[PDB]
Design a protein around this ligand. Structure first.
Ligand code: HEM
Ligand SMILES: CCCCCCCCCCCO[C@@H]1O[C@H](CO)[C@@H](O[C@H]2O[C@H](CO)[C@@H](O)[C@H](O)[C@H]2O)[C@H](O)[C@H]1O
Lengths: 431, 55
């Protein structure tokens, strides 16, 4: 009823949900793509896929279990889902995969087949997923030569050069008890899980701490992947944002909610209380846009992504959007701040109070790894309601006004002006 | 000349015309700029500048 957190060597964290009809048990490691290098980039993604390999999944399915794995920038997860009663069967599989097995999943035929699978996977993403590919390039240029610049799926070049040894090296260096948290969500009790874990013994690399490196840094820059054969222009643009556990974490998320998301083809989306919408609908400057406040351990990105077929008016799209951002520093109104509060609460509620145990597992593990605990919506909502117009203006004057930007784009971006023209729009002339 | 040689009439008309022509030049410069605008400037390589423009 408040999320329990116990440690006996292995940190166990659970979140009991009485309305849930299933249960998820897994392990979340405090290491992701941000802990790789340009040459082993994609190793985590390769691990995810061998864990989700047919051999491993068939074994789990026979037991009535479903496997899930997510590779993020700061973390990595491996979850098993089952009925509330088969919760102990999940632990056995989990125990087996990360303690008993090794040479079973890393066999020549399984590794090569899995490698070939992720290779075609990544190739398709880079070849067809334009909005996400652009967002990945935003991170790449914004944090270039820094941990946060590496794509989570890895790069084709490094992927084709990866061997079983690379996987093992990463596992020995990151899949450690000191860098992990065993999570339990859905319909399960803490005692049931802690005792079932405390039932077994061993340690498997005890006291071993993960590798350390240099911190993430934001660099005003841009990467342009022009492709005149594509039907649209896809653009992502952002300034240095807030890291997780930043004092302005919510103020930044609220600022992003002010401008929000938009889908020109959805009737209700066109009626939102967003001033930018009055400027962009007259000549239909875009098909959609979405503002974000991405937060990581060392840094973050605040900005937006947009897609448009109006290739001759991209300059107006960017101009109007950045002119609106200017407003956060000098003229954002009370009702805009109040509307943002309500919608932010709804966003967080939908994110944290989702009816999915695997989602809760990922969120719970990631947070307890970073701050040792998980913040409740009750506390989050209180912080949000305390945000004032002066807080937004103070934050904007620091993060937005006359600040460097990172830009990424693909498709028909001839109309996207030079860096300086876009950068100049981060402020307004004053007397 | 307005007479038998360069005299008063000549100087007075030359000043009137000296005032006028600069405005005709201004008009011709507008025409010059119009011709320039439809094709844009050339460049030192002598090839198309269409692949890489800046404002
Ligand atoms: C009051 C006189 C004039 C003004 C104000 C003027 C102004 C301009 C301007 C602003 C440009 C664009 C930038 C540049 O290339 O310098 C231009 C281009 C040009 N002008 Fe003039 N101009 C004048 C006289 C002339 C004359 C006397 C000629 C030739 C007999 C001429 C030939 C050109 C040409 C061919 C270009 C194109 C250059 C290129 O882009 O390669 N202009 N002029
Ligand atoms: C015809 C001959 C007459 C010549 C007269 C010279 C004109 C001088 C104008 C000088 C300053 O005009 C001034 O320019 C600076 C940018 O440099 C503007 O600054 C604006 O952009 C800068 C740079 O992104 C921001 O830091 C700043 O917060 C913002 O207000 C300022 O608001 C404006 O007031």
């Amino acid at each position: 009823a408040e999320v329990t957190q116990l440690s006996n060597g292995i940190v166990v964290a659970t979140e009991h949900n009485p309305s849930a009809h299933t249960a998820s048990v897994g392990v979340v490691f405090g290491s992701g793509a941000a802990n790789e290098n340009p040459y082993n980039n994609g190793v985590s993604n390769l691990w995810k896929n061998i864990f989700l390999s047919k051999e491993n999944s068939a074994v789990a399915a026979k037991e009535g279990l479903a496997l899930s794995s997510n590779i993020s920038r700061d973390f990595q997860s491996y979850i098993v889902s089952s009925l509330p009663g088969s919760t102990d069967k999940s632990l056995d599989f989990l125990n087996q995969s990360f303690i008993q097995q090794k040479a079973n999943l890393l066999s020549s035929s399984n590794f090569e087949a899995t490698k070939k699978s992720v290779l075609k996977q990544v190739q398709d993403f880079e070849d067809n997923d334009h909005p996400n590919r652009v967002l990945e390039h935003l991170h790449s240029t914004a944090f270039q030569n820094t941990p946060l610049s590496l794509p989570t799926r890895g790069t084709l070049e490094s992927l084709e050069n990866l061997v079983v040894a690379d996987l093992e090296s990463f596992a020995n260096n990151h899949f450690l008890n000191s860098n992990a948290v065993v999570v339990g969500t859905g319909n399960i009790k803490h005692e049931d899980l802690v005792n079932s874990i405390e039932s077994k013994n061993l340690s498997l690399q005890t006291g071993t701490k993960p590798v350390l490196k240099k911190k993430a840094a934001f660099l005003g820059s841009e990467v342009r992947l022009r492709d005149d054969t594509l039907p649209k222009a896809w653009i992502s643009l952002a300034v240095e944002g807030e890291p997780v556990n930043s004092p302005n974490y919510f103020v930044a998320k609220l600022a992003a909610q002010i401008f929000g998301s938009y889908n020109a083809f959805e009737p209700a989306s066109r009626l939102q209380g967003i001033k930018l919408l009055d400027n962009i609908q007259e000549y239909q400057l875009c098909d959609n846009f979405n503002h974000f406040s991405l937060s990581y351990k060392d840094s973050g990105l605040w900005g937006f992504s947009t897609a448009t077929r109006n290739v001759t008016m991209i300059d107006d799209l960017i101009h109007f959007t950045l002119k609106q951002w200017n407003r956060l520093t000098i003229s954002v109104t009370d009702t805009e701040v109040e509307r943002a509060k309500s919608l932010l609460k709804l966003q967080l509620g939908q994110l944290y109070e989702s009816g999915n145990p695997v989602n809760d597992a990922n969120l719970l593990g990631a947070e307890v790894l970073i701050k040792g605990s998980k913040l409740s919506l009750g506390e989050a909502f209180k912080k949000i309601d305390a945000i004032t117009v002066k807080d937004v203006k103070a934050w904007a004057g620091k993060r937005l006004w006359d600040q460097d930007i990172a830009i990424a784009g693909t498709g028909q971006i001839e109309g996207l002006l030079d860096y300086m023209r876009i950068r100049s729009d981060m402020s307004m002339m004053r007397w | 000349w307005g007479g038998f040689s360069v005299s008063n009439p000549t100087i007075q008309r030359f000043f009137a015309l000296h005032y006028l022509v600069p405005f005709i030049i201004a008009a011709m410069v507008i025409m010059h700029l119009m011709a320039l605008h439809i094709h844009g400037s050339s460049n030192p390589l002598g090839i198309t500048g269409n692949l890489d423009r800046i404002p």
